[PDB]
Short mmCIF file of C-alpha atoms and ligand atoms in Angstrom, two decimals:
data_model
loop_
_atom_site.label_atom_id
_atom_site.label_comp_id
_atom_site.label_asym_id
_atom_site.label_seq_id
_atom_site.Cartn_x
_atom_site.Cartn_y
_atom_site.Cartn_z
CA UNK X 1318 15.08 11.46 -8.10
CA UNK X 1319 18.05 11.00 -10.11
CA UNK X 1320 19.93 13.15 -7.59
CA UNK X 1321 19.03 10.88 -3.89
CA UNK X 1322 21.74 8.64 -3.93
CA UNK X 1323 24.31 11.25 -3.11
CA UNK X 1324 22.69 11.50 0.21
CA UNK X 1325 20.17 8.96 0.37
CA UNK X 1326 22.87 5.93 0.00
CA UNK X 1327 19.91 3.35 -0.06
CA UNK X 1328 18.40 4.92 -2.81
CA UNK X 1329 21.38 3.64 -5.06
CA UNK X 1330 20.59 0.39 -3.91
CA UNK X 1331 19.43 -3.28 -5.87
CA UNK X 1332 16.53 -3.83 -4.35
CA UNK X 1333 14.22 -0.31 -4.96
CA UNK X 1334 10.91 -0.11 -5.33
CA UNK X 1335 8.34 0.03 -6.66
CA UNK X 1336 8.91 -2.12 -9.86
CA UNK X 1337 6.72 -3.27 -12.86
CA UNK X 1338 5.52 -6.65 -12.58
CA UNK X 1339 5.85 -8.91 -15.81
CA UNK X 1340 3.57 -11.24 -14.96
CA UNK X 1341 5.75 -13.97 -17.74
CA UNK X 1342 8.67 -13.21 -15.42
CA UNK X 1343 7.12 -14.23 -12.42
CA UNK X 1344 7.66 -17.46 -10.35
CA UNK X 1345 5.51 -19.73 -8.78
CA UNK X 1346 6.22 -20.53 -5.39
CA UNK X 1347 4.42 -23.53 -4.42
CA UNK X 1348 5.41 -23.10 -0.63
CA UNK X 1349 4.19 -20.03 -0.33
CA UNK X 1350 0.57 -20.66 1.17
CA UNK X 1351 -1.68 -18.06 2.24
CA UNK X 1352 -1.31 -14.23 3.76
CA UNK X 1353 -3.02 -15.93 7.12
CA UNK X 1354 -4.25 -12.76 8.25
CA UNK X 1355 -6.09 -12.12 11.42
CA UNK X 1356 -8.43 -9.02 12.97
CA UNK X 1357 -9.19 -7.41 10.40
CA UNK X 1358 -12.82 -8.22 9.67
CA UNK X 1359 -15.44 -5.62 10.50
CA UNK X 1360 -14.76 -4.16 14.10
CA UNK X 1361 -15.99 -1.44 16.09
CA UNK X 1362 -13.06 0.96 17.60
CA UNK X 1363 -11.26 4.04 16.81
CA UNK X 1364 -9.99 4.60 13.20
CA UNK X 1365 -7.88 7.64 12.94
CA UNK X 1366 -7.96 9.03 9.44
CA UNK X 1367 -5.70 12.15 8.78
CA UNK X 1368 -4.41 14.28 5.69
CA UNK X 1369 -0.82 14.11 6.26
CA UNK X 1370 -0.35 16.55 3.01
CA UNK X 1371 0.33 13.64 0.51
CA UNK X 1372 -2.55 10.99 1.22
CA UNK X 1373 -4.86 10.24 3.77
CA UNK X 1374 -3.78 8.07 6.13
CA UNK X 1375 -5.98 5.58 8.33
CA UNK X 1376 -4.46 4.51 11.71
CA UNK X 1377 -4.61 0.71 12.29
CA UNK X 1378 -4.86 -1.35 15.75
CA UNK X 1379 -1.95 -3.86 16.63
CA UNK X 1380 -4.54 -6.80 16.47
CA UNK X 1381 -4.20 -6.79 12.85
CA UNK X 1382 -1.89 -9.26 11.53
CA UNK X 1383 -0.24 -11.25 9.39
CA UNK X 1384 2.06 -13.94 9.11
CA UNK X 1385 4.53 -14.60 6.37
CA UNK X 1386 5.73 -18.36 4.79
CA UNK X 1387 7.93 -18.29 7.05
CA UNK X 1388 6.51 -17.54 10.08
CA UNK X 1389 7.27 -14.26 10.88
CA UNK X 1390 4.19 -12.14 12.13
CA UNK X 1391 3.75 -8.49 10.91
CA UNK X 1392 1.80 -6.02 13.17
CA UNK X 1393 -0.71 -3.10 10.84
CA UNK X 1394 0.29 0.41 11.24
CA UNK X 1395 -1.52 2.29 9.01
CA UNK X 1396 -3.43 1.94 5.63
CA UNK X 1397 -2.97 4.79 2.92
CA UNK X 1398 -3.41 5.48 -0.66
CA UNK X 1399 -1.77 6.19 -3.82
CA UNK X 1400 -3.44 8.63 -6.61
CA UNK X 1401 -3.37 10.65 -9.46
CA UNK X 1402 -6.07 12.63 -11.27
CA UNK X 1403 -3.80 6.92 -15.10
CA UNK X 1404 -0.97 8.16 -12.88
CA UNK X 1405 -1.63 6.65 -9.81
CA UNK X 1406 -0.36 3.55 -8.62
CA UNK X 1407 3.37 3.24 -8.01
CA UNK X 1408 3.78 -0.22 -9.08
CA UNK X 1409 2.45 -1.70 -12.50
CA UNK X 1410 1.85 -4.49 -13.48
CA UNK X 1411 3.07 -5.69 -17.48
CA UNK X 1412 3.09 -1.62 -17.71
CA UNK X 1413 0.15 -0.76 -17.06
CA UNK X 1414 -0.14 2.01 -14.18
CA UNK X 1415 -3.45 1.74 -12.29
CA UNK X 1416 -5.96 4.80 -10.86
CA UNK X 1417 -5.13 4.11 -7.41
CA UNK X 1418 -3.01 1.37 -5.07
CA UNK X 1419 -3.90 1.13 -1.50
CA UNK X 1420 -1.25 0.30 0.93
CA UNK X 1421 -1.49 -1.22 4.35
CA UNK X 1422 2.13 -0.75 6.39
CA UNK X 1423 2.82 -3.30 8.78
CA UNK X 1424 6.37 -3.85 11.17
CA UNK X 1425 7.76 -7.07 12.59
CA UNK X 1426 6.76 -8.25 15.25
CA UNK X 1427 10.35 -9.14 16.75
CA UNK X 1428 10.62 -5.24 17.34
CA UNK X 1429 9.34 -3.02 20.29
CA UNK X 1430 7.74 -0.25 17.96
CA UNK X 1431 7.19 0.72 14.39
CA UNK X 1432 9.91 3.58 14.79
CA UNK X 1433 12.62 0.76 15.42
CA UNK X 1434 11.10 -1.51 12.65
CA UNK X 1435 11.75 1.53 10.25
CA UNK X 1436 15.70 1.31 10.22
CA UNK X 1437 15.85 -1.99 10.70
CA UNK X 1438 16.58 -5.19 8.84
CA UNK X 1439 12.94 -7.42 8.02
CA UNK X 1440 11.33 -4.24 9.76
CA UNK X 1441 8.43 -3.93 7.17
CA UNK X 1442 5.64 -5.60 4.55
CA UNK X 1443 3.68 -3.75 2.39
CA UNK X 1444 0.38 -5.48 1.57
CA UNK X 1445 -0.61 -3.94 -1.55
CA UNK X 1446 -3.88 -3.43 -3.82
CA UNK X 1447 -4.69 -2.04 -7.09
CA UNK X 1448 -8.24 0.08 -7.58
CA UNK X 1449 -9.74 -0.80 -11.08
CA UNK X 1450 -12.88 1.27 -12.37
CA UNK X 1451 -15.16 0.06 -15.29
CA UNK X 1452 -19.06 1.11 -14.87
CA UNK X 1453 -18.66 -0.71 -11.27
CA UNK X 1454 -21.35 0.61 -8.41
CA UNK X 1455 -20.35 2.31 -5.11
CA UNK X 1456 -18.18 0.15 -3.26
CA UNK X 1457 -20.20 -0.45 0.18
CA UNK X 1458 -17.45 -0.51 2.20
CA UNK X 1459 -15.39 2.59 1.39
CA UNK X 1460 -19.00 4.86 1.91
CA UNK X 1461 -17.77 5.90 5.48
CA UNK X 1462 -14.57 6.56 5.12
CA UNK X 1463 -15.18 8.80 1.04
CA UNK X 1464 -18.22 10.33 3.37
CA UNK X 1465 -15.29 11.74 6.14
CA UNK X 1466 -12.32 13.04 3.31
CA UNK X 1467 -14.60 16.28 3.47
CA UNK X 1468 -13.68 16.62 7.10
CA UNK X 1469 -10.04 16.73 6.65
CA UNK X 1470 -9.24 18.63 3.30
CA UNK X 1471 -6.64 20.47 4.81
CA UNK X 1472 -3.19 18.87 5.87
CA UNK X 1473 -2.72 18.38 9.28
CA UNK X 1474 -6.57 17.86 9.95
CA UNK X 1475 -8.31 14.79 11.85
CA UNK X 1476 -11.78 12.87 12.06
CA UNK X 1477 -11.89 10.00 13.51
CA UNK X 1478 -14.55 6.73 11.94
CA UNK X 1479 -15.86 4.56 15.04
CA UNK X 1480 -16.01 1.41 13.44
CA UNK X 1481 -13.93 -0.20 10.01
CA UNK X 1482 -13.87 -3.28 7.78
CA UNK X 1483 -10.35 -3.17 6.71
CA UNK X 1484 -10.60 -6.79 5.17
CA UNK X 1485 -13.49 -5.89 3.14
CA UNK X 1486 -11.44 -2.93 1.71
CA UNK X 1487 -9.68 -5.23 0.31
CA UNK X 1488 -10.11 -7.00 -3.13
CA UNK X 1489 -12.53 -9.72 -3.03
CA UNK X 1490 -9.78 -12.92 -3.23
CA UNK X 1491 -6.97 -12.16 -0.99
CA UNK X 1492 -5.69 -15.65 -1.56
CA UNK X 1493 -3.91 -14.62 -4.21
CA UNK X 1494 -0.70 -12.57 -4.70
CA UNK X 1495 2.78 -11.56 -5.79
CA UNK X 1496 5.91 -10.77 -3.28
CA UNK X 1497 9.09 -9.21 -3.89
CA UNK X 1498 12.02 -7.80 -1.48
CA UNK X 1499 11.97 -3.92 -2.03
CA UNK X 1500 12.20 -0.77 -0.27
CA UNK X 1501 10.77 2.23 0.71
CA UNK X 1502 9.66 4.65 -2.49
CA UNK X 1503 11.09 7.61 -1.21
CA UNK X 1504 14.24 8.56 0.45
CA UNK X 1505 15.68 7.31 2.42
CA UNK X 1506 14.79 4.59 0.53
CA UNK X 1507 15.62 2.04 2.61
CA UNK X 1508 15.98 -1.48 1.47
CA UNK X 1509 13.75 -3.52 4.21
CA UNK X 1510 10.70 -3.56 2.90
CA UNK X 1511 8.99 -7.21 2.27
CA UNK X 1512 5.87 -6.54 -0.45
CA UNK X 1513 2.73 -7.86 -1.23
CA UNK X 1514 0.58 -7.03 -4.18
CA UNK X 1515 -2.60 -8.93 -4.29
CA UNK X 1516 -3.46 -10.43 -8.07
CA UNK X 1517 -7.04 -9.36 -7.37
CA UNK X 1518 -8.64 -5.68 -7.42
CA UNK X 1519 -10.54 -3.62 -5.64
CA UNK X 1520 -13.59 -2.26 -7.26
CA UNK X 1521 -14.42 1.39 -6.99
CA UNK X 1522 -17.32 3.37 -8.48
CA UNK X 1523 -16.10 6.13 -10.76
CA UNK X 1524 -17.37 8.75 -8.30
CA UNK X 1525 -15.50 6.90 -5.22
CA UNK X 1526 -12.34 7.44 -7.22
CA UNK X 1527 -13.03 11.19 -8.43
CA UNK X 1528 -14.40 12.55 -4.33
CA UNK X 1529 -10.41 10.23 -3.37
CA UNK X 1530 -8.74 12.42 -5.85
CA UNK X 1531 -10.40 15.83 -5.03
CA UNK X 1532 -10.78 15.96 -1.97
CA UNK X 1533 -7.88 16.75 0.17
CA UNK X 1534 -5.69 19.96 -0.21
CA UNK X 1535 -2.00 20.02 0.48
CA UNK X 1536 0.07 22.68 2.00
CA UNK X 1537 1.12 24.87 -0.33
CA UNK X 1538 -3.03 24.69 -0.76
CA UNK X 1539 -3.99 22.94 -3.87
CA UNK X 1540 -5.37 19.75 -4.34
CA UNK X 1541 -2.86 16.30 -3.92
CA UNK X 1542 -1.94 15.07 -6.72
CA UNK X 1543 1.76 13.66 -6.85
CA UNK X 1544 5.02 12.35 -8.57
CA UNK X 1545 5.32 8.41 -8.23
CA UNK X 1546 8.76 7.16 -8.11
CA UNK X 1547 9.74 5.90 -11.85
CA UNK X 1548 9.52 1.82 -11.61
CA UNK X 1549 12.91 0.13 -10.55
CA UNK X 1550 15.20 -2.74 -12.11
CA UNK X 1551 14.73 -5.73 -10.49
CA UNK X 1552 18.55 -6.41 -11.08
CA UNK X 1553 19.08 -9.41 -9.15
CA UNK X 1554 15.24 -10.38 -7.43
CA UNK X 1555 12.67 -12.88 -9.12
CA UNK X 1556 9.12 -11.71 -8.26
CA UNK X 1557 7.65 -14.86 -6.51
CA UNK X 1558 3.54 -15.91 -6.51
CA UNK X 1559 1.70 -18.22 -4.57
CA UNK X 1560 -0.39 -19.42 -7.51
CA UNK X 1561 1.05 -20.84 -11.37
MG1 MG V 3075 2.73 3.85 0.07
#
């Protein structure tokens, strides 16, 4: 890690992610209003969910959207998640590490495809969530989706869920949340990367979290559980929220 800017230039970049929130650092944007999200309420379709040999990854359609403060619209790609097995989130927040963060990828609009967003400038947002467990129950909406990890717990397999409430995957306020300029969290790193972590969390049952850490197998054939990228400097960025 120490090692990827000799061939990673981004990666010895200012703006790296992920980062640790201090929450006393952060400033409050009164301009920035909401997330203004649309289509991604509960929807029949096609849901693609793989094991890519790091995470499982959910295919999204290009009706979900968002749009930024200022006005740019960001198209969902996919939605995947972060874990250990607390080692699991790659961002924290005042230190603190949390069991899981779930991460929906989206590209700007102004660009034909995803692949083009990737490499270029304003190409991605991150919408971001932290899991929290307590003595919570089983969290309705994740029941389909823990129910298929069994059918892909080697990498490279597929199922497929007919039907998906991405929204209610999602913690419970999504009015709420903190944005910083960043990158990508592993090589090549690059720097164009607009993030969202929500204030709010999602709830999991203790059992929801243990079947999303146990589940899948990677390739050399043992179960996934793997290095986060250390938190970054923040060097010259204020984290911004939409709330005081
Ligand atoms: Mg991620």
């Amino acid at each position: 890690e120490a090692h990827w800017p000799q061939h990673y230039p981004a990666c010895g970049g200012q703006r790296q992610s992920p980062i640790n929130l201090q929450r006393t650092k952060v400033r409050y944007n009164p301009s920035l209003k909401g997330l203004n999200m649309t289509g991604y309420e509960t929807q029949a379709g096609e849901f693609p969910m793989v094991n890519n040999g790091h995470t499982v990854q959910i295919s999204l359609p290009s009706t979900m959207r968002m749009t930024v403060a200022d006005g740019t619209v960001y198209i969902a790609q996919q939605m995947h998640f972060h874990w250990g097995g607390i080692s699991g989130s790659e961002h924290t927040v005042d230190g603190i590490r949390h069991v899981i963060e779930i991460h929906i990828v989206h590209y700007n609009s102004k660009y034909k495809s995803y692949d083009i967003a990737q490499d270029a400038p304003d190409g991605l947002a991150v919408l971001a969530a932290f899991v929290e467990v307590k003595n919570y129950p089983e969290n309705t909406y994740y029941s389909n989706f823990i129910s298929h990890l069994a059918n892909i717990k080697y990498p490279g397999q597929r199922t497929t869920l007919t039907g998906l409430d991405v929204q209610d995957m999602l913690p419970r306020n999504l009015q709420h949340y903190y944005t910083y300029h960043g990158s990508l969290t592993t090589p090549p790193c690059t720097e164009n990367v607009h993030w969202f972590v929500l204030a709010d969390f999602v709830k999991l049952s203790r059992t929801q979290v243990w079947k999303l850490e146990n589940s899948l197998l990677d390739h050399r054939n043992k179960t996934i559980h793997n290095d986060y990228r250390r938190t970054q400097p923040l060097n010259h960025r204020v984290v911004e929220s939409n709330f005081p």
